[PDB]
Amino acid sequence: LSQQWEAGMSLLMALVVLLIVAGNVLVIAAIGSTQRLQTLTNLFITSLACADLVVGLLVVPFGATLVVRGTWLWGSFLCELWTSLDVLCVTASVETLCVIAIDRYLAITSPFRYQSLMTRARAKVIICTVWAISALVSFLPIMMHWWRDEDPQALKCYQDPGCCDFVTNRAYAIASSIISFYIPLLIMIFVALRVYREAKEQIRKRKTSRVMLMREHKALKTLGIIMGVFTLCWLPFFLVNIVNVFNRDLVPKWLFVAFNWLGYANSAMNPIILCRSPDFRKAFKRLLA
Ligand SMILES: CCCCCCCC/C=C\CCCCCCCC(=O)OC[C@H](O)CO
Ligand SMILES: CCCCCCCC/C=C\CCCCCCCC(=O)OC[C@H](O)CO
Ligand SMILES: CC(C)(C)NC[C@H](O)COc1cccc2c1CC(C#N)=N2
Ligand SMILES: NC(=O)CN(CC(=O)O)CC(=O)O
Ligand code: NA
Ligand code: NA
């Protein structure tokens, strides 16, 4: 009966990996094969799809083995590398979303300046910077062991290569959460709501025709959906992360795990959301025979 749960979960995990990996490869292949999707924003979408792809290839497969076997198989170094890459992908995702929000805000409020100053290459640089900042805030604190807690339970986990629970001290939990997630999220949300306001003002009445603006507004809607779904998927984990460093009894392990998997599920969601934007849909239809 533990074998039918081990087999039951193995098959389900393999399908999660397939969906994440194939969906995000399909997004990247749509953008790379279609003139109409060669927009700056979609370059930023590429960054997201990449973080999702690292989630599907590296993070979920290690994680599934933890989930179904109930112990860590891969030794102490890969435990730390896995954790670091998990933390990095979440960080780079929320920083890219906050950049998309700011970029669009500047695009709609200064279309002339924006289109005369932004390039495909200058976007690729912003993206690079994002991943460099994300890797710094992610990798460095892990590497330096600034996260370690001094409780015996924590110390027993750290001595056991078969334990890979991210048991951290309070200081690290709060500070890493602020810097990796809560500040870029709050900024993304504030700025996105202003983009939404300004778009609304504009269609109501730019020299642009109202039909052209409505088409601009459909593509902005896509990005807003991705942002709201990212918020719904990750905010519970981050709220619970903080409750739990203050009282470990408030959040049982299996529940903590469930919240973390709702975050990982975000990486399946974007390609599916993109399926309903018209330009992406067309491209997916062509690509899949
Ligand atoms: C009118 C006065 C109202 C003031 C209220 C605003 C308060 C803070 C709001 C946003 C912070 C903006 C932080 C800027 C950090 C983003 C850096 C960046 O790289 O932006 C992406 C780039 O612009 C892509 O083209
Ligand atoms: C609870 C999640 C909070 C976090 C949120 C993050 C920022 C998202 C900002 C705005 C929503 C974007 C979608 C805006 C949709 C407006 C489109 C509309 O007009 O509604 C139906 C339309 O009329 C039919 O064509
Ligand atoms: C298996 C684990 C627990 C590894 N999953 C990590 C989670 O997906 C991402 O969690 C985080 C992302 C960024 C910053 C973070 C963070 C957790 C903490 C803490 N203290 N700081
Ligand atoms: N045996 C090894 O290769 C690594 N070891 C030690 C470690 O990962 O810290 C794992 C173990 O002792 O179970
Ligand atoms: Na992501
Ligand atoms: Na361990």
Author numbering: 36 to 240, 275 to 358
What does the paper say about this structure?
In contrast, crystallisation of an ultra-thermostable mutant β1AR-JM50 with cyanopindolol in LCP produced well-ordered plate-like crystals over 100 μm across. β1AR-JM50 is 12°C more thermostable than β36-m23 due to the inclusion of 3 additional thermostabilising mutations (I129V, D322K, Y343L). Importantly the overall dimensions of the ligand binding pocket are identical between the structures of β1AR determined in LCP compared to OTG, with the distance between the Cαs of Ser2115.42 and Asn3297.39, which changes when either an agonist or antagonist is bound, being identical (16.0 Å) to within experimental error. In the cyanopindolol-bound β1AR LCP structure the side chains of Ser2125.43 and Asn3106.55 also form a hydrogen bond. The LCP structure of β1AR-JM50 allowed the identification of 38 water molecules, 7 lipid or detergent molecules and 2 bound Na+ ions per receptor. The Na+ ion bound in EL2 was identified previously, but the intramembrane Na+ ion was not, due to its unexpected position within the hydrophobic core of the receptor. Firstly, the site is within 2.2–2.6 Å of 5 densities assigned to 3 water molecules, the hydroxyl oxygen of Ser1283.39 and a carboxyl oxygen of Asp872.50. This results in the proposed Na+ ion being co-ordinated with 5 oxygen atoms in a distorted square pyramidal configuration, as observed in many other protein structures. In contrast, the Cα atoms of 7 polar amino acid residues conserved between β1AR and A2AR that co-ordinate either the Na+ ion or the associated water network, reveal considerable conservation of the structure of this region (rmsd 0.3 Å). Measurement of the thermostability of ligand-free β1AR in the presence or absence of Na+ showed that the thermostability of β1AR dropped by 7.5°C in the absence of Na+, suggesting a direct role for intramembrane Na+ in maintaining the stability of the ligand-free receptor.
There are three β-adrenoceptors (βARs) encoded by the human genome, β1AR, β2AR and β3AR, which are all members of the G protein-coupled receptor (GPCR) superfamily. Receptor activation is characterised by a large outward movement of the cytoplasmic ends of transmembrane helices H5 and H6, which opens up a cleft at the cytoplasmic face of the receptor, allowing G protein binding and, hence, activation of the G protein. Here we present the 2.1 Å resolution structure of thermostabilised β1AR crystallised in LCP without the use of a fusion protein, which has facilitated the identification of an intramembrane Na+ ion important in maintaining receptor stability.
